[PDB]
């Protein structure tokens, strides 16, 4: 049982919204030991769905793994301008991951709530996502 985290700062969230496509991937982060398994984050600005069109979708993708499957629990959260966690989403259940398989939330955060300056979620037009993974 290994636990690690990864912070993803997306620059020019609104400024380069159209250059971001239907989906954009993040850099690959390891187990915190850099030995066997590699993950990355996959976010959908539009949600590519009718029910989640007003939402931003966030996923945890398993890039490479030595074994056949990997069971892991994940937790997504947004870091506000003062570094604090907000709008956290997670499932107490663990999920099976295979090379090229991903798990996440289609409706993770409302775009309206995200772009609202009152929530202080986009300082310097940067969206800072936080992910914590617990491999079993």
């Amino acid at each position: 049982v290994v636990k690690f985290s990864y912070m993803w700062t997306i620059n020019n969230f609104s400024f380069c919204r159209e250059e971001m496509g239907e989906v954009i991937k993040s850099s690959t982060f390891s187990s915190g030991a850099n030995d066997k398994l590699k993950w990355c984050l996959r976010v959908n600005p539009k949600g590519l769905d009718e029910e989640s069109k007003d939402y931003l979708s966030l996923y945890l993708l398993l890039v490479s793994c030595p074994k056949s499957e990997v069971r892991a629990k994940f937790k997504f959260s947004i870091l506000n301008a003062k570094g604090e966690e907000t709008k956290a989403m997670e499932d107490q259940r663990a999920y099976r991951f295979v090379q090229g398989k991903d798990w996440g939330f289609k409706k993770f955060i409302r775009r309206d709530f995200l772009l609202d300056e009152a929530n202080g979620l986009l300082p310097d037009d940067k969206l800072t996502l936080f992910c914590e993974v617990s491999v079993v």
Partner: peptide, 7 residues
């Protein structure tokens, strides 16, 4: 936990 999905 109910709320989760994949691609």
């Amino acid at each position: 936990t109910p709320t989760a999905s994949s691609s």
